[PDB]
UniProtKB/Swiss-Prot annotation:
It is an enzyme of class 3 (hydrolase). It catalyses: Hydrolysis of proteins with specificity similar to that of pepsin A, prefers hydrophobic residues at P1 and P1', but does not cleave 14-Ala-|-Leu-15 in the B chain of insulin or Z-Glu-Tyr. Clots milk. Belongs to the peptidase A1 family. Disulfide bonds join C255-C290. Keywords: Aspartyl protease, Disulfide bond, Hydrolase, Protease, Signal, Zymogen. The active site is at D35, S199. GO terms for biological process: proteolysis. Its EC number is 3.4.23.22. The gene is EAPA. The keyword Mitochondrion does not apply. It comes from Cryphonectria parasitica. One of its GO terms (molecular function) is aspartic-type endopeptidase activity. This is Endothiapepsin.
């Protein structure tokens, strides 16, 4: 089997991407944030505290003929941005892009934090990191990908995120029309439950490539590119008037600037992030200070290849016995 679904930016900045997901019988379609950095499939629901719902579409298990309570199971998750959610668990039929899993754990939120409530466009998350990170207790649950894997034509999924445009998540096949050149594959460590890999270095603009190992994770659920302070300082030093602002919470730059590209290494291959991808616009409405898309990972404890980086590539998440990542230009 295969599946193929379009993923769409939630706003003009590509702050996140939503993908329609069918849950239950008859189908209830919710728009979920596919997150290669976490391992829970959770939804706004008929159980979510009413004051914490503001425009989201909810899953109502009582209206699904295939929903079953997973008796005694609970879940509770915290994200790197400080957001959180928790609740109880149903099993149900879940389909993505024509690919169906029966018996998927659908984590029903009873509580969500303010950042979820305030984002009316995201109806929940679909985690695509390793199942070892799933937070269901007392019986940990599998991700949608792990449940689908044995049925797939190839044990893979691919992320093809757009810049200010829709893109695609495919399951079970690699669309050879979706990228240019060849795919370069690189080793993955699953020790922390992430798609963790080592970039071979970076360049700023037209500058020389610096060969240096940068461990980090491929995380579709993180907007920005978070890298070591040395690398980030080297990038922003090429933008006149850029500075790190403790008041704003990262690097800002004059909205009048033209940003340089940023290149990262994948083995001997190179992915180039155009400068425009690194513009996250005014820090507040009407400001002439703009927020940068490359930020320091200092204090996060891990480097994160978020959407700013991933959207410059066609990315293969190879879930074979020994997992690997692939990157191609596009
Ligand atoms: C085994 O789960 C123990 C509970 O974990 C709590 C928890 O917040 N975990 C978590 C947070 C963010 C991403 C992710 F993948 C996992």
């Amino acid at each position: 089997s295969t599946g193929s679904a379009t993923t769409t930016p939630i706003d003009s900045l590509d702050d996140a991407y939503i993908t329609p997901v069918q849950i239950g019988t008859p189908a209830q379609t919710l728009n979920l944030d596919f997150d290669t950095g976490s391992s829970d499939l959770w939804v706004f629901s008929s159980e979510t505290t009413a004051s914490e719902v503001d425009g989201q579409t909810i899953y109502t298990p009582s209206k699904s003929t295939t929903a079953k309570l997973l008796s005694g199971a609970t879940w509770s998750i915290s994200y790197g941005d400080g957001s959180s959610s928790s609740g109880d668990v149903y099993t149900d039929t879940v389909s993505v892009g024509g690919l169906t899993v029966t018996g998927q754990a659908v984590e029903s939120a009873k509580k969500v934090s303010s950042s979820f409530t305030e984002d009316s466009t995201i109806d929940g998350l679909l985690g695509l990191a390793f199942s070892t990170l799933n937070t269901v207790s007392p019986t940990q649950q599998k991700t949608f990908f792990d449940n689908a894997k044995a049925s797939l034509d190839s044990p893979v999924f691919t992320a093809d995120l757009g810049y200010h445009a829709p893109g695609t998540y495919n399951f079970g096949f690699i669309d050879t029309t979706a990228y240019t050149g060849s795919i370069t594959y690189t080793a993955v460590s699953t020790k922390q439950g992430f798609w963790e890999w080592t970039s071979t270095g970076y360049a700023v603009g037209s500058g020389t490539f610096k060969s240096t190992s940068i461990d980090g994770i491929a995380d579709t659920g993180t907007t920005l590119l978070y890298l070591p302070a040395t690398v980030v300082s080297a990038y922003w030093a090429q933008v006149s008037g850029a500075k790190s602002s403790s008041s704003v919470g990262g690097y800002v730059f004059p909205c009048s600037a033209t940003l340089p590209s940023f290149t990262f290494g994948v083995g001997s291959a190179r992915i180039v992030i155009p400068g425009d991808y690194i513009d996250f616009g005014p820090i507040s409405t009407g400001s002439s200070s703009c927020f940068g898309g490359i930020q320091s990972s200092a204090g996060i404890g891990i480097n994160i290849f978020g959407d700013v980086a991933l959207k410059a590539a066609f990315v293969v998440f190879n879930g074979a016995t020994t997992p690997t990542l692939g990157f191609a230009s596009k």
